[PDB]
RNA sequence: GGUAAAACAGCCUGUGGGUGAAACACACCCACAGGGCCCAUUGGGCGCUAGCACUCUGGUAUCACCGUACCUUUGUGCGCCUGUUUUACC
């Protein structure tokens, strides 16, 4: 039977300078033929530790491994806020090789307020037909976060889409945009186009807007 | 860095079809390393895929491909392959070769990775994007930093690269992850911050690329008067 | 690698541990279990032999006895073959 390896947690959230333990556990033995990798958004795995307790070159030593019959752990001793990955464990033991689900670290930090920054539509978009308005809610913290548009006052309800960034490495802050998309034709049946952002950083929900034909 | 994997053969193909990856390496030689191939489904965990033997060229497959998918090494060009037939839709995913190291330096930890490649199994036809821009404005504006960006719409299948002046332009970037429409096309947006005092001087240029549909688009992005 | 000089090992079959750019396969090293053949059999020997030296156990011919020569067997040293390792010089 394919040996399994159960990782734990799924995600944490650490503040920088915490110490951070990750939990790999075997189903059946598999001496120390055990890998660690950070996964850093949109990159290839790199390796960490391998033989479960061997700093691999290169690599911080902040970063650890240690061994216990069938547990493994990698311990992170002081999180930097490059750290922010997902951490995978890998048995090497016996075919097939097998990855636990990952950990993906999360850095704690203080509240920053998102700037907020509306897009008109281009006219180049306009005369092949559609129109996308843009709200950007830029270097905020935590990633919760509520956008909400107004058409000339009357609210939007499936008319829009987020996406949201990974943590950024540096400031351990989130960006977001919501695009409000409507065709020319409705898009020109109104005139004001809000785009309306809560968030705990700031004391009040931050409104910005346009008038169309006027950008 | 010195040793590199360096891979091709993705793409979008259809279910029930066949692609060959290769997997290029540099800085040493395939035929004293164990080489694997690893993939990961879009928003998933790695799940390793296959792997071959150095001296015996013995091969061993993860059950959900065994059967269908075939690793092979060609030396004489130290070149790795992954050739991959009957494809499922849960064979989307971005794959990965991988150099096992030598034991006695890292165990049997990978120690060098490709850089990806993404195969995409779909019966959906190609289609390109469409640059829009997104221009800066006092409606941009913030303490002397302006917002401005680039609109990438109705495109398929991922990825798109989005760079700014020919990569000139990298800190205060952000790409957003791309987002899958109700059409079933992608879309997405990358948005810049910039000094708002180089809003007059310095041109802005975003460059999208969507390899499956071999576009490559230059776009520049001039500040609106709201 | 070449040269020179050494060391260690070598009946068969599996098994385990290790090393070789090495998870298996392969090569080599090192152990263990079981087995085979020879002997003078509570034990000892076996890389190979049409040879060599010596020795030893049984024979065969000389042959009154004694003594001699050949065969065989126990070993020892050679000769012959393989594997690995080491040193010096080039």
């Known amino acids: 039977s394919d040996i399994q390896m159960t990782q734990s947690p799924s995600s944490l959230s650490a503040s920088v300078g915490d110490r951070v333990t990750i939990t790999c556990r075997a189903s059946?033995?598999?001496?120390?033929?055990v890998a660690w990798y950070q996964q850093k958004p949109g990159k290839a795995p790199k390796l960490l530790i391998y033989?479960?307790?061997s700093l691999y070159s290169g690599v911080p030593s902040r970063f650890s491994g240690s061994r216990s019959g069938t547990d493994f752990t990698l311990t992170i001793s002081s999180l930097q806020p490059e750290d922010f990955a997902t951490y995978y464990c890998?048995?090497?033991?016996?075919?097939?090789?097998?990855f636990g689900q990952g950990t993906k670290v999360e850095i704690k930090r203080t509240v920053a307020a998102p700037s907020v920054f509306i897009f008109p539509p281009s006219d180049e978009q306009l005369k092949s037909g559609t129109a996308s308005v843009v709200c950007l809610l830029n270097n905020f913290y935590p990633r919760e976060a509520k956008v909400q548009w107004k058409v000339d006052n009357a609210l939007q309800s499936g008319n829009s889409q987020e996406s949201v960034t990974e943590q950024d490495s540096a400031d351990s802050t989130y960006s977001l945009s919501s695009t409000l998309t409507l065709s020319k034709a409705d898009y020109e049946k109104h005139k004001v186009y809000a785009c309306e952002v809560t968030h705990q950083g700031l004391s009040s929900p931050v409104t910005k807007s346009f008038n169309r034909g006027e950008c | 860095s010195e040793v590199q994997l360096v891979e091709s053969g993705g793409g979008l193909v259809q279910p029930g079809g066949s692609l060959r990856l290769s997997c290029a390496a540099s800085?040493?030689?395939?035929?004293?390393?164990?080489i694997h191939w690893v993939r990961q489904a879009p928003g998933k965990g790695l799940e390793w895929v296959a792997s071959?033997?150095?001296?015996?060229?013995?091969?061993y497959y993860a059950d959900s491909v065994k059967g269908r998918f075939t690793i092979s090494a060609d030396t004489s060009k130290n070149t790795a392959y992954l050739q991959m037939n009957s494809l499922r839709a849960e064979d989307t995913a971005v794959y990965y070769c991988?150099?096992?190291?030598?034991?006695?330096?890292?165990?049997?930890?990978?120690?060098?990775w490709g850089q990806g490649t993404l195969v995409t199994v779909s019966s959906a036809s190609t289609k390109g994007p469409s640059v829009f821009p997104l221009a800066p404005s006092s409606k941009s504006t913030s303490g002397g930093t302006a917002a401005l960006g680039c609109l990438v719409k109705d495109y398929f299948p991922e990825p798109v690269t989005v760079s700014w002046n020919s990569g000139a332009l990298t800190s205060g970037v952000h790409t957003f992850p791309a987002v899958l429409q109700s059409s079933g096309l992608y879309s997405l947006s990358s948005v810049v911050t910039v000094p708002s005092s180089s809003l007059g001087t310095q041109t802005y240029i975003c460059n999208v690329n969507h390899k499956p549909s071999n576009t490559k688009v230059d776009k520049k992005v001039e500040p609106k008067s709201c």
């Open positions: 991988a150099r096992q190291g030598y034991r006695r330096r890292s165990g049997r930890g990978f120690d060098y």
């Open positions: 800085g040493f030689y395939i035929s004293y390393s164990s």
């Open positions: 071959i033997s150095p001296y015996s060229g013995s091969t």
């Open positions: 059946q033995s598999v001496s120390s033929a």
């Open positions: 033989s479960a307790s």
């Open positions: 890998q048995q090497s033991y016996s075919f097939p090789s097998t």
